[PDB]
Amino acid sequence: FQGSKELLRLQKELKDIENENVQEIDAHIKDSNFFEWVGFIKGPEGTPYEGGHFTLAITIPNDYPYNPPKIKFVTKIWHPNISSQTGAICLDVLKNEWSPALTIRTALLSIQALLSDPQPDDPQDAEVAKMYKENHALFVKTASVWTKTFATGP
Protein backbone atom coordinates (compact mmCIF):
# COMPACT_ATOMS: atom_id res chain seq x y z
CA PHE A 1 0.00 0.00 0.00
CA GLN A 2 1.55 3.26 1.26
CA GLY A 3 3.83 5.17 -1.15
CA SER A 4 3.65 7.98 -3.75
CA LYS A 5 0.50 9.61 -5.24
CA GLU A 6 1.22 7.70 -8.49
CA LEU A 7 1.52 4.38 -6.65
CA LEU A 8 -1.76 4.95 -4.76
CA ARG A 9 -3.46 5.84 -8.08
CA LEU A 10 -2.23 2.69 -9.82
CA GLN A 11 -3.27 0.63 -6.87
CA LYS A 12 -6.82 2.02 -7.03
CA GLU A 13 -7.07 1.45 -10.82
CA LEU A 14 -6.09 -2.19 -10.36
CA LYS A 15 -8.51 -2.86 -7.51
CA ASP A 16 -11.36 -1.24 -9.52
CA ILE A 17 -10.54 -3.23 -12.67
CA GLU A 18 -10.50 -6.28 -10.43
CA ASN A 19 -13.96 -5.24 -9.18
CA GLU A 20 -15.39 -4.55 -12.67
CA ASN A 21 -16.22 -7.02 -15.50
CA VAL A 22 -12.90 -8.84 -15.92
CA GLN A 23 -14.44 -11.09 -18.56
CA GLU A 24 -14.45 -8.05 -20.81
CA ILE A 25 -11.48 -6.01 -19.70
CA ASP A 26 -8.77 -7.10 -17.31
CA ALA A 27 -5.23 -5.95 -16.36
CA HIS A 28 -2.60 -6.93 -13.79
CA ILE A 29 1.10 -6.17 -13.17
CA LYS A 30 3.28 -8.04 -15.64
CA ASP A 31 6.20 -8.91 -13.32
CA SER A 32 7.77 -6.62 -10.69
CA ASN A 33 7.22 -3.13 -12.15
CA PHE A 34 3.98 -1.39 -11.09
CA PHE A 35 4.38 0.79 -14.24
CA GLU A 36 4.15 -2.14 -16.61
CA TRP A 37 0.95 -4.07 -17.01
CA VAL A 38 -0.45 -6.73 -19.20
CA GLY A 39 -3.99 -6.03 -20.40
CA PHE A 40 -6.73 -8.39 -21.60
CA ILE A 41 -9.51 -7.46 -24.04
CA LYS A 42 -12.31 -9.80 -24.96
CA GLY A 43 -13.02 -9.90 -28.68
CA PRO A 44 -16.62 -8.61 -29.10
CA GLU A 45 -19.53 -10.91 -30.01
CA GLY A 46 -20.83 -10.67 -33.58
CA THR A 47 -17.45 -9.45 -34.90
CA PRO A 48 -14.61 -11.35 -36.53
CA TYR A 49 -12.89 -11.11 -33.08
CA GLU A 50 -15.49 -13.15 -31.34
CA GLY A 51 -14.06 -15.83 -28.97
CA GLY A 52 -10.70 -14.05 -29.07
CA HIS A 53 -8.71 -13.22 -25.96
CA PHE A 54 -6.30 -10.40 -26.69
CA THR A 55 -3.23 -9.58 -24.61
CA LEU A 56 -1.78 -6.06 -24.64
CA ALA A 57 1.35 -4.43 -23.14
CA ILE A 58 0.65 -1.32 -21.06
CA THR A 59 3.58 0.93 -20.12
CA ILE A 60 2.49 3.59 -17.61
CA PRO A 61 4.56 6.78 -17.37
CA ASN A 62 6.17 7.89 -14.08
CA ASP A 63 3.96 11.00 -13.90
CA TYR A 64 0.68 9.16 -14.42
CA PRO A 65 -2.20 10.25 -14.35
CA TYR A 66 -0.79 13.46 -15.91
CA ASN A 67 0.33 11.57 -19.03
CA PRO A 68 -1.35 8.73 -20.99
CA PRO A 69 -0.26 5.07 -20.93
CA LYS A 70 1.41 3.59 -24.01
CA ILE A 71 -0.49 0.52 -25.24
CA LYS A 72 0.25 -2.04 -27.98
CA PHE A 73 -1.25 -5.42 -28.66
CA VAL A 74 0.85 -8.49 -27.86
CA THR A 75 -1.61 -10.92 -29.38
CA LYS A 76 -1.33 -10.87 -33.16
CA ILE A 77 -4.47 -9.50 -34.81
CA TRP A 78 -5.78 -8.64 -38.31
CA HIS A 79 -7.39 -5.16 -38.05
CA PRO A 80 -7.03 -1.96 -40.15
CA ASN A 81 -6.23 0.06 -37.06
CA ILE A 82 -3.48 -2.21 -35.64
CA SER A 83 -0.11 -3.27 -37.13
CA SER A 84 -0.53 -6.92 -38.19
CA GLN A 85 3.20 -7.32 -37.40
CA THR A 86 3.92 -5.23 -34.27
CA GLY A 87 0.52 -4.71 -32.54
CA ALA A 88 0.97 -0.94 -32.57
CA ILE A 89 -2.17 1.26 -32.52
CA CYS A 90 -2.68 4.98 -33.11
CA LEU A 91 -3.28 6.61 -29.72
CA ASP A 92 -3.20 10.26 -30.92
CA VAL A 93 -6.77 10.63 -29.72
CA LEU A 94 -6.16 9.63 -26.08
CA LYS A 95 -2.77 11.39 -26.21
CA ASN A 96 -4.41 14.80 -26.69
CA GLU A 97 -7.59 13.88 -24.82
CA TRP A 98 -5.66 12.60 -21.77
CA SER A 99 -6.42 13.88 -18.29
CA PRO A 100 -6.34 12.52 -14.69
CA ALA A 101 -10.05 11.80 -15.21
CA LEU A 102 -9.31 9.04 -17.74
CA THR A 103 -8.36 5.49 -16.65
CA ILE A 104 -6.56 2.54 -18.14
CA ARG A 105 -9.76 0.41 -18.20
CA THR A 106 -11.43 3.16 -20.18
CA ALA A 107 -8.41 3.28 -22.60
CA LEU A 108 -8.89 -0.44 -23.01
CA LEU A 109 -12.68 -0.22 -23.43
CA SER A 110 -12.15 2.24 -26.25
CA ILE A 111 -9.72 -0.16 -27.93
CA GLN A 112 -12.29 -2.92 -27.63
CA ALA A 113 -14.77 -0.47 -29.23
CA LEU A 114 -12.32 -0.20 -32.17
CA LEU A 115 -12.48 -4.01 -32.53
CA SER A 116 -16.26 -3.64 -32.85
CA ASP A 117 -16.06 -0.74 -35.19
CA PRO A 118 -12.90 -0.50 -37.34
CA GLN A 119 -11.93 2.96 -38.71
CA PRO A 120 -10.48 2.33 -42.23
CA ASP A 121 -9.74 6.00 -43.14
CA ASP A 122 -7.24 6.42 -40.27
CA PRO A 123 -5.31 3.26 -41.04
CA GLN A 124 -2.44 1.62 -39.16
CA ASP A 125 -1.73 -1.35 -41.40
CA ALA A 126 -1.82 -0.50 -45.17
CA GLU A 127 -2.33 -4.12 -46.26
CA VAL A 128 -5.18 -4.81 -43.80
CA ALA A 129 -6.84 -1.48 -44.68
CA LYS A 130 -6.55 -2.14 -48.43
CA MET A 131 -8.22 -5.50 -47.85
CA TYR A 132 -10.85 -4.04 -45.54
CA LYS A 133 -11.89 -1.57 -48.26
CA GLU A 134 -11.17 -3.62 -51.48
CA ASN A 135 -12.47 -7.07 -50.39
CA HIS A 136 -14.22 -6.81 -47.10
CA ALA A 137 -15.75 -10.27 -47.05
CA LEU A 138 -12.15 -11.56 -47.20
CA PHE A 139 -11.11 -9.20 -44.43
CA VAL A 140 -13.73 -10.72 -42.18
CA LYS A 141 -12.46 -14.20 -43.03
CA THR A 142 -8.79 -13.31 -42.55
CA ALA A 143 -9.52 -11.57 -39.21
CA SER A 144 -11.51 -14.57 -38.13
CA VAL A 145 -8.69 -17.09 -39.05
CA TRP A 146 -6.19 -14.98 -37.11
CA THR A 147 -8.50 -14.79 -34.07
CA LYS A 148 -9.02 -18.54 -33.95
CA THR A 149 -5.27 -19.08 -34.58
CA PHE A 150 -3.48 -16.40 -32.51
CA ALA A 151 -6.08 -15.28 -29.90
CA THR A 152 -7.13 -18.65 -28.53
CA GLY A 153 -8.12 -19.39 -24.87
CA PRO A 154 -6.08 -18.54 -21.68
Coordinates of N, CA and C in Angstrom, one line a residue:
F1 N 0.8 -1.2 0.0 CA 0.0 0.0 0.0 C 0.9 1.3 0.0
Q2 N 1.0 1.9 1.2 CA 1.5 3.3 1.3 C 2.8 3.6 0.4
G3 N 2.8 4.8 -0.2 CA 3.8 5.2 -1.1 C 3.3 6.4 -1.9
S4 N 4.0 6.8 -3.0 CA 3.6 8.0 -3.8 C 2.2 8.1 -4.2
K5 N 1.8 9.3 -4.6 CA 0.5 9.6 -5.2 C 0.2 8.8 -6.5
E6 N 1.3 8.6 -7.3 CA 1.2 7.7 -8.5 C 1.0 6.2 -8.1
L7 N 1.7 5.7 -7.1 CA 1.5 4.4 -6.6 C 0.1 4.1 -6.1
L8 N -0.4 5.1 -5.3 CA -1.8 4.9 -4.8 C -2.8 4.9 -5.9
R9 N -2.6 5.7 -6.9 CA -3.5 5.8 -8.1 C -3.5 4.5 -8.9
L10 N -2.3 4.0 -9.2 CA -2.2 2.7 -9.8 C -2.9 1.6 -9.0
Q11 N -2.7 1.7 -7.7 CA -3.3 0.6 -6.9 C -4.8 0.6 -6.9
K12 N -5.4 1.8 -6.9 CA -6.8 2.0 -7.0 C -7.3 1.5 -8.4
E13 N -6.7 1.9 -9.5 CA -7.1 1.4 -10.8 C -7.2 -0.1 -10.9
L14 N -6.1 -0.7 -10.4 CA -6.1 -2.2 -10.4 C -7.2 -2.8 -9.5
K15 N -7.4 -2.3 -8.3 CA -8.5 -2.9 -7.5 C -9.9 -2.7 -8.2
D16 N -10.1 -1.5 -8.9 CA -11.4 -1.2 -9.5 C -11.6 -2.1 -10.7
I17 N -10.5 -2.3 -11.5 CA -10.5 -3.2 -12.7 C -10.9 -4.6 -12.2
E18 N -10.3 -5.0 -11.1 CA -10.5 -6.3 -10.4 C -12.0 -6.4 -10.0
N19 N -12.6 -5.3 -9.7 CA -14.0 -5.2 -9.2 C -15.0 -5.1 -10.3
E20 N -14.6 -4.6 -11.5 CA -15.4 -4.6 -12.7 C -15.5 -5.9 -13.4
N21 N -16.0 -5.8 -14.7 CA -16.2 -7.0 -15.5 C -14.9 -7.5 -16.2
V22 N -14.2 -8.4 -15.5 CA -12.9 -8.8 -15.9 C -13.0 -9.8 -17.1
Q23 N -14.2 -10.2 -17.4 CA -14.4 -11.1 -18.6 C -14.3 -10.3 -19.8
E24 N -14.6 -9.0 -19.7 CA -14.5 -8.0 -20.8 C -13.1 -7.4 -20.9
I25 N -12.7 -6.8 -19.8 CA -11.5 -6.0 -19.7 C -10.8 -6.4 -18.4
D26 N -9.6 -6.8 -18.5 CA -8.8 -7.1 -17.3 C -7.4 -6.5 -17.5
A27 N -6.6 -6.3 -16.4 CA -5.2 -5.9 -16.4 C -4.6 -6.3 -15.0
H28 N -3.4 -6.7 -15.0 CA -2.6 -6.9 -13.8 C -1.1 -6.5 -14.1
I29 N -0.3 -6.4 -13.0 CA 1.1 -6.2 -13.2 C 1.7 -7.3 -13.9
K30 N 2.6 -7.0 -14.9 CA 3.3 -8.0 -15.6 C 4.2 -8.9 -14.8
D31 N 5.2 -8.2 -14.1 CA 6.2 -8.9 -13.3 C 6.4 -8.2 -12.0
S32 N 7.4 -7.3 -11.9 CA 7.8 -6.6 -10.7 C 7.7 -5.1 -10.8
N33 N 7.3 -4.6 -11.9 CA 7.2 -3.1 -12.2 C 5.7 -2.7 -12.2
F34 N 5.3 -1.9 -11.2 CA 4.0 -1.4 -11.1 C 3.6 -0.5 -12.3
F35 N 4.6 -0.1 -13.1 CA 4.4 0.8 -14.2 C 4.3 0.0 -15.5
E36 N 4.2 -1.3 -15.4 CA 4.2 -2.1 -16.6 C 3.1 -3.2 -16.4
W37 N 2.0 -3.1 -17.1 CA 0.9 -4.1 -17.0 C 0.8 -4.8 -18.3
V38 N 0.1 -5.9 -18.1 CA -0.4 -6.7 -19.2 C -1.9 -6.5 -19.1
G39 N -2.5 -6.1 -20.3 CA -4.0 -6.0 -20.4 C -4.6 -7.1 -21.2
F40 N -5.9 -7.5 -20.8 CA -6.7 -8.4 -21.6 C -8.0 -7.7 -22.2
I41 N -8.2 -7.9 -23.4 CA -9.5 -7.5 -24.0 C -10.2 -8.6 -24.7
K42 N -11.5 -8.8 -24.3 CA -12.3 -9.8 -25.0 C -12.7 -9.3 -26.3
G43 N -12.5 -10.2 -27.3 CA -13.0 -9.9 -28.7 C -14.5 -9.9 -28.7
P44 N -15.2 -8.8 -29.1 CA -16.6 -8.6 -29.1 C -17.5 -9.6 -29.9
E45 N -18.6 -10.0 -29.3 CA -19.5 -10.9 -30.0 C -20.0 -10.3 -31.3
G46 N -20.5 -11.1 -32.2 CA -20.8 -10.7 -33.6 C -19.8 -9.8 -34.3
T47 N -18.5 -10.1 -34.1 CA -17.5 -9.5 -34.9 C -16.5 -10.6 -35.3
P48 N -15.6 -10.3 -36.2 CA -14.6 -11.4 -36.5 C -13.6 -11.7 -35.4
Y49 N -13.8 -10.9 -34.2 CA -12.9 -11.1 -33.1 C -13.5 -11.9 -32.0
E50 N -14.7 -12.5 -32.3 CA -15.5 -13.1 -31.3 C -14.8 -14.4 -30.9
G51 N -14.8 -14.7 -29.6 CA -14.1 -15.8 -29.0 C -12.6 -15.6 -28.8
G52 N -12.1 -14.4 -29.2 CA -10.7 -14.0 -29.1 C -10.4 -13.5 -27.7
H53 N -9.2 -13.7 -27.2 CA -8.7 -13.2 -26.0 C -7.4 -12.5 -26.3
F54 N -7.4 -11.2 -26.3 CA -6.3 -10.4 -26.7 C -5.5 -9.8 -25.6
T55 N -4.2 -10.1 -25.6 CA -3.2 -9.6 -24.6 C -2.6 -8.3 -25.2
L56 N -2.4 -7.3 -24.3 CA -1.8 -6.1 -24.6 C -0.7 -5.8 -23.6
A57 N 0.3 -4.9 -24.0 CA 1.3 -4.4 -23.1 C 1.1 -3.0 -22.8
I58 N 1.0 -2.7 -21.5 CA 0.7 -1.3 -21.1 C 1.8 -0.7 -20.3
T59 N 2.5 0.3 -20.9 CA 3.6 0.9 -20.1 C 3.1 2.3 -19.6
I60 N 3.1 2.4 -18.3 CA 2.5 3.6 -17.6 C 3.6 4.5 -17.3
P61 N 3.5 5.8 -17.6 CA 4.6 6.8 -17.4 C 4.7 7.1 -15.9
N62 N 5.9 7.6 -15.5 CA 6.2 7.9 -14.1 C 5.4 9.1 -13.5
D63 N 4.8 9.9 -14.3 CA 4.0 11.0 -13.9 C 2.5 10.7 -14.0
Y64 N 2.1 9.5 -14.4 CA 0.7 9.2 -14.4 C 0.0 9.7 -13.1
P65 N -1.3 10.2 -13.2 CA -2.2 10.2 -14.3 C -2.1 11.5 -15.2
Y66 N -1.0 12.2 -15.2 CA -0.8 13.5 -15.9 C -0.3 13.2 -17.3
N67 N 0.1 12.0 -17.7 CA 0.3 11.6 -19.0 C -0.3 10.2 -19.3
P68 N -0.7 10.0 -20.6 CA -1.4 8.7 -21.0 C -0.4 7.5 -20.9
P69 N -1.1 6.3 -20.8 CA -0.3 5.1 -20.9 C 0.1 4.9 -22.4
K70 N 1.2 4.1 -22.7 CA 1.4 3.6 -24.0 C 0.9 2.2 -24.0
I71 N 0.1 1.8 -25.1 CA -0.5 0.5 -25.2 C -0.2 0.0 -26.6
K72 N 0.1 -1.3 -26.7 CA 0.2 -2.0 -28.0 C -0.3 -3.5 -27.8
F73 N -0.7 -4.1 -28.8 CA -1.2 -5.4 -28.7 C 0.0 -6.3 -28.6
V74 N -0.2 -7.5 -27.9 CA 0.8 -8.5 -27.9 C 0.3 -9.5 -28.8
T75 N -0.9 -9.9 -28.6 CA -1.6 -10.9 -29.4 C -1.7 -10.4 -30.8
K76 N -1.3 -11.2 -31.8 CA -1.3 -10.9 -33.2 C -2.8 -10.8 -33.6
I77 N -3.1 -9.9 -34.5 CA -4.5 -9.5 -34.8 C -4.5 -8.8 -36.2
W78 N -5.6 -9.2 -37.0 CA -5.8 -8.6 -38.3 C -6.9 -7.6 -38.2
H79 N -6.5 -6.3 -38.3 CA -7.4 -5.2 -38.1 C -6.8 -3.9 -38.7
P80 N -7.6 -3.1 -39.4 CA -7.0 -2.0 -40.2 C -6.4 -0.9 -39.2
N81 N -6.8 -0.9 -38.0 CA -6.2 0.1 -37.1 C -5.1 -0.4 -36.1
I82 N -4.5 -1.6 -36.5 CA -3.5 -2.2 -35.6 C -2.5 -2.9 -36.6
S83 N -1.2 -2.6 -36.3 CA -0.1 -3.3 -37.1 C -0.2 -4.8 -37.0
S84 N -0.4 -5.5 -38.1 CA -0.5 -6.9 -38.2 C 0.8 -7.6 -37.8
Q85 N 1.9 -6.8 -37.7 CA 3.2 -7.3 -37.4 C 3.8 -6.9 -36.1
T86 N 3.4 -5.7 -35.6 CA 3.9 -5.2 -34.3 C 2.9 -4.9 -33.2
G87 N 1.6 -5.0 -33.5 CA 0.5 -4.7 -32.5 C 0.3 -3.3 -32.2
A88 N 1.1 -2.4 -32.8 CA 1.0 -0.9 -32.6 C -0.4 -0.4 -33.0
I89 N -0.9 0.6 -32.2 CA -2.2 1.3 -32.5 C -2.0 2.8 -32.5
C90 N -2.8 3.5 -33.2 CA -2.7 5.0 -33.1 C -3.4 5.5 -31.9
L91 N -2.7 6.1 -30.9 CA -3.3 6.6 -29.7 C -3.3 8.1 -29.7
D92 N -3.2 8.8 -30.8 CA -3.2 10.3 -30.9 C -4.4 10.8 -30.2
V93 N -5.6 10.2 -30.4 CA -6.8 10.6 -29.7 C -6.6 10.7 -28.2
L94 N -6.3 9.5 -27.5 CA -6.2 9.6 -26.1 C -5.0 10.5 -25.6
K95 N -3.9 10.5 -26.4 CA -2.8 11.4 -26.2 C -3.3 12.8 -25.9
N96 N -4.0 13.4 -26.9 CA -4.4 14.8 -26.7 C -5.7 14.9 -25.9
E97 N -6.4 13.9 -25.7 CA -7.6 13.9 -24.8 C -7.2 13.6 -23.4
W98 N -6.0 13.1 -23.1 CA -5.7 12.6 -21.8 C -5.8 13.6 -20.6
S99 N -6.4 13.2 -19.6 CA -6.4 13.9 -18.3 C -6.6 12.9 -17.2
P100 N -6.1 13.2 -16.0 CA -6.3 12.5 -14.7 C -7.7 11.9 -14.5
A101 N -8.7 12.4 -15.3 CA -10.0 11.8 -15.2 C -10.1 10.4 -15.9
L102 N -9.3 10.3 -17.0 CA -9.3 9.0 -17.7 C -8.6 7.9 -16.9
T103 N -8.9 6.7 -17.3 CA -8.4 5.5 -16.7 C -7.9 4.5 -17.7
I104 N -7.0 3.6 -17.3 CA -6.6 2.5 -18.1 C -7.7 1.6 -18.6
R105 N -8.6 1.2 -17.7 CA -9.8 0.4 -18.2 C -10.6 1.2 -19.3
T106 N -10.7 2.5 -19.1 CA -11.4 3.2 -20.2 C -10.6 3.2 -21.5
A107 N -9.3 3.4 -21.4 CA -8.4 3.3 -22.6 C -8.6 1.9 -23.3
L108 N -8.7 0.9 -22.5 CA -8.9 -0.4 -23.0 C -10.3 -0.7 -23.6
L109 N -11.3 -0.1 -22.9 CA -12.7 -0.2 -23.4 C -12.8 0.5 -24.8
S110 N -12.0 1.6 -25.0 CA -12.1 2.2 -26.2 C -11.4 1.5 -27.3
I111 N -10.4 0.6 -27.0 CA -9.7 -0.2 -27.9 C -10.7 -1.3 -28.3
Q112 N -11.3 -1.9 -27.3 CA -12.3 -2.9 -27.6 C -13.4 -2.4 -28.5
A113 N -13.8 -1.1 -28.3 CA -14.8 -0.5 -29.2 C -14.2 -0.5 -30.7
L114 N -13.0 -0.1 -30.9 CA -12.3 -0.2 -32.2 C -12.4 -1.6 -32.8
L115 N -12.3 -2.6 -32.0 CA -12.5 -4.0 -32.5 C -13.9 -4.2 -33.1
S116 N -14.9 -3.7 -32.4 CA -16.3 -3.6 -32.8 C -16.5 -2.8 -34.0
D117 N -15.7 -1.7 -34.2 CA -16.1 -0.7 -35.2 C -14.8 -0.2 -35.8
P118 N -14.2 -0.9 -36.8 CA -12.9 -0.5 -37.3 C -13.0 0.8 -38.1
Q119 N -12.0 1.6 -38.1 CA -11.9 3.0 -38.7 C -11.0 3.1 -39.9
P120 N -11.4 2.6 -41.1 CA -10.5 2.3 -42.2 C -9.8 3.5 -42.8
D121 N -10.3 4.7 -42.6 CA -9.7 6.0 -43.1 C -8.5 6.6 -42.4
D122 N -8.3 6.0 -41.2 CA -7.2 6.4 -40.3 C -6.3 5.2 -40.0
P123 N -5.7 4.7 -41.1 CA -5.3 3.3 -41.0 C -3.9 3.1 -40.4
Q124 N -3.7 1.9 -39.8 CA -2.4 1.6 -39.2 C -1.6 0.6 -40.0
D125 N -2.3 -0.3 -40.6 CA -1.7 -1.3 -41.4 C -2.3 -1.2 -42.8
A126 N -1.4 -0.8 -43.8 CA -1.8 -0.5 -45.2 C -2.4 -1.7 -45.9
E127 N -1.9 -2.9 -45.6 CA -2.3 -4.1 -46.3 C -3.7 -4.6 -45.7
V128 N -3.9 -4.5 -44.4 CA -5.2 -4.8 -43.8 C -6.2 -3.8 -44.3
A129 N -5.9 -2.5 -44.3 CA -6.8 -1.5 -44.7 C -7.3 -1.6 -46.2
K130 N -6.3 -1.9 -47.0 CA -6.6 -2.1 -48.4 C -7.6 -3.3 -48.5
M131 N -7.3 -4.4 -47.8 CA -8.2 -5.5 -47.9 C -9.6 -5.2 -47.3
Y132 N -9.6 -4.4 -46.2 CA -10.9 -4.0 -45.5 C -11.8 -3.3 -46.5
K133 N -11.2 -2.3 -47.2 CA -11.9 -1.6 -48.3 C -12.1 -2.4 -49.6
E134 N -11.1 -2.9 -50.2 CA -11.2 -3.6 -51.5 C -11.9 -5.0 -51.5
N135 N -11.8 -5.8 -50.4 CA -12.5 -7.1 -50.4 C -12.7 -7.3 -48.9
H136 N -13.9 -6.9 -48.5 CA -14.2 -6.8 -47.1 C -14.6 -8.2 -46.6
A137 N -15.3 -9.0 -47.5 CA -15.7 -10.3 -47.0 C -14.5 -11.2 -46.8
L138 N -13.4 -10.8 -47.4 CA -12.2 -11.6 -47.2 C -11.6 -11.1 -45.9
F139 N -11.6 -9.8 -45.7 CA -11.1 -9.2 -44.4 C -11.7 -9.9 -43.3
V140 N -13.0 -10.1 -43.3 CA -13.7 -10.7 -42.2 C -13.2 -12.1 -42.0
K141 N -13.0 -12.8 -43.1 CA -12.5 -14.2 -43.0 C -11.0 -14.3 -42.5
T142 N -10.2 -13.3 -43.0 CA -8.8 -13.3 -42.5 C -8.7 -13.0 -41.0
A143 N -9.4 -12.0 -40.6 CA -9.5 -11.6 -39.2 C -10.1 -12.7 -38.3
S144 N -11.1 -13.4 -38.8 CA -11.5 -14.6 -38.1 C -10.5 -15.8 -38.0
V145 N -9.8 -16.1 -39.1 CA -8.7 -17.1 -39.1 C -7.7 -16.7 -38.0
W146 N -7.2 -15.5 -38.1 CA -6.2 -15.0 -37.1 C -6.7 -15.0 -35.7
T147 N -7.9 -14.7 -35.4 CA -8.5 -14.8 -34.1 C -8.5 -16.2 -33.5
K148 N -8.9 -17.2 -34.4 CA -9.0 -18.5 -33.9 C -7.6 -19.2 -33.9
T149 N -6.7 -18.6 -34.6 CA -5.3 -19.1 -34.6 C -4.4 -18.5 -33.5
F150 N -4.4 -17.2 -33.4 CA -3.5 -16.4 -32.5 C -4.1 -15.9 -31.2
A151 N -5.4 -15.9 -31.1 CA -6.1 -15.3 -29.9 C -7.0 -16.3 -29.2
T152 N -6.5 -17.5 -29.2 CA -7.1 -18.7 -28.5 C -7.1 -18.5 -27.0
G153 N -7.9 -19.4 -26.3 CA -8.1 -19.4 -24.9 C -6.9 -19.2 -24.0
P154 N -7.1 -18.9 -22.7 CA -6.1 -18.5 -21.7 C -5.0 -19.6 -21.5

